[PDB]
């Protein structure tokens, strides 16, 4: 009753209205035009200072949203840390996939710093002065703050509101250890013969042909938390070795995450900034099924370094149409598909594993 909604048909100029549950495809930007409000100015400053005094040097972001939030808040953090006379600077860099885990967590301060503001995005402050102690948020900085000394997955979303002109987000520092992705932004639905698992960064679709199987996926990031089981369809009697998207990369532990003839893709092109998994041949190539084809290895790109395409591929026991990845630099193939007569020493391969 709280949620009422209408569905439109642009083809027939028709409308159907009613009440229920609505799941929106929010992964196009999921980042543009947002107003983030982490815990509190003084609270967050105290937490950062206590973390620095405890041996934590930096933060490894769990998703793009957290990186954007840090980038938007760094100015006020620096101002407030300056005001309390704390010799500390927060530096925010770019994010590089995949986003590896960190073994630390931000602490919950008992008392906040007794100086500063009471809200975010205000006070018309003056920029602080750079210091020699830097609290680094992920960038190309794995020499002074190694991954072993970084925090990871420390926030919980409290409210994701859609305002008239700008849309607010309310965060909070959690109190317990966890490896699960935030369940407040996950939406899963099945209706007839189509399903979808989704969140702010993933949009995974599955279909029913003669069995439920994966259809296509659209990822704008590669996080490494765990998908909650409470937001997953058909989680029983499934083994880790058949999930297409690996469990280590926040893949649902579901029968909807499978396809016949393929096993888990531990060595795909997970270094890309954005992927689209789909079952279709790379342009200009052809795939056969032969028993003499080679064994599975790391994923290969369709075009060599110079830019010419390889037009002969085989797989041992996979099923058509082939599994492929679509990135900005080109088209890759799944681990099960290898060139028919071309030496692999002249091809581009992936150097990442999950």
């Amino acid at each position, epitope marked *: 009753h709280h949620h009422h909604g209408c569905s439109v048909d642009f083809s027939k100029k028709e409308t159907r209205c009613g009440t229920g549950v609505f799941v929106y495809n929010d992964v196009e930007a999921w980042r543009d035009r947002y107003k983030y409000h982490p815990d509190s100015p003084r609270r967050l400053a105290a937490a950062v200072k206590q973390a620095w005094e405890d041996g934590i040097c930096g933060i490894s972001s769990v998703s793009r949203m957290e990186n954007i939030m840090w980038r938007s808040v760094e100015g006020e953090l620096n101002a407030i840390l300056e005001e309390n006379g704390v010799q500390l600077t927060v530096v925010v860099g770019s994010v590089k996939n995949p986003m590896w885990r960190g073994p630390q967590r931000l602490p919950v301060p008992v008392n906040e710093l007794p100086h500063g503001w009471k809200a975010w995005g205000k006070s018309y402050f003056v920029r602080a002065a750079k210091t020699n102690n830097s609290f680094v948020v992920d960038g190309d900085t794995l020499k002074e703050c190694p991954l072993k000394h970084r925090a990871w997955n420390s926030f919980l979303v409290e409210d994701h509101g859609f305002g008239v002109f700008h849309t607010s987000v309310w965060l909070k520092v959690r109190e317990d250890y966890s490896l699960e992705c935030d369940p407040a932004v996950i939406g899963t639905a099945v209706k007839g013969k189509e399903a979808v698992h989704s969140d702010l960064g993933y949009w995974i679709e599955s279909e029913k042909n003669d069995t439920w199987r994966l259809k296509r996926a659209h990822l704008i990031e590669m996080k490494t938390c765990e998908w909650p089981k409470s937001h997953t369809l058909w989680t029983d009697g499934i083994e880790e070795s058949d999930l297409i998207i690996p469990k280590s990369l926040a893949g649902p532990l579901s029968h909807h995450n499978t396809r016949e003839g393929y096993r888990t893709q531990m060595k795909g092109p997970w270094h890309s900034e954005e992927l689209e998994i789909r079952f279709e041949e790379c342009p200009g190539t052809k795939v056969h099924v032969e028993e*003499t084809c080679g064994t599975r290895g790391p994923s290969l790109r369709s075009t060599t*370094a*110079s830019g010419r395409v390889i037009e002969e591929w085989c797989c041992r026991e996979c099923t058509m149409p082939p599994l492929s990845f679509r990135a900005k630099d080109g088209c890759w193939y799944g681990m099960e598909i290898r060139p028919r*007569k071309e*030496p692999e*020493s*002249n091809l581009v391969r992936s150097m990442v594993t999950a």
Partner: antibody
Amino acid sequence: VELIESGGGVVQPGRSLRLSCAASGFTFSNYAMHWVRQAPGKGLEWVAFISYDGSNKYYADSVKGRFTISRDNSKNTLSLQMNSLRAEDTALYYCARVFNGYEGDYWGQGTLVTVSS
Amino acid sequence: LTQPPSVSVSPGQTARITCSGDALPKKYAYWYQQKSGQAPVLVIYEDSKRPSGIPERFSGSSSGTMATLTISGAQVEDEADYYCYSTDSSGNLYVFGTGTKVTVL
């Protein structure tokens, strides 16, 4: 489309020698390069291979361990460091760009290396 | 990879050059021509194709475990040495054929 290699000469057995090959006319950081040698009056023979960015390196069995290959993508230079030479290594050495179908296969000119005393 | 030591033909005839070896059913083979005192020249790539600028009398094919080069209408300027070039089962170690001497009478 110009491959010029140099650095050969007469050397006593057991010493070490270094070869170089300068490339121009194409994007050097996009192609893998080979080293091929040919004894006087005999057939061609593969020696070594380096990937398009130096990540992968493979050597022939007869010279494995003694030799080493490297490249410098910044200045378009290919090099082969040879150690513990013997009499069997006397041959003309090439600097090839083979296995690039319909994109052309270009060879150097050859720098003779003779091992004796 | 092994090839016959020599092949001798008459002008206007056809020359068949064979290169037999393992891992050939799974890998391509390139053919190189080296005239006396020059750098080798590619004449056939991927077992059936010829690069632009090579006379249309050059043809080749592969079948099972043997790749063959055919010189249709062999003439006098084809005095050369021919080498098949391929890889080993892993695709990591390359290898040349023993070479074939072609004499045209």
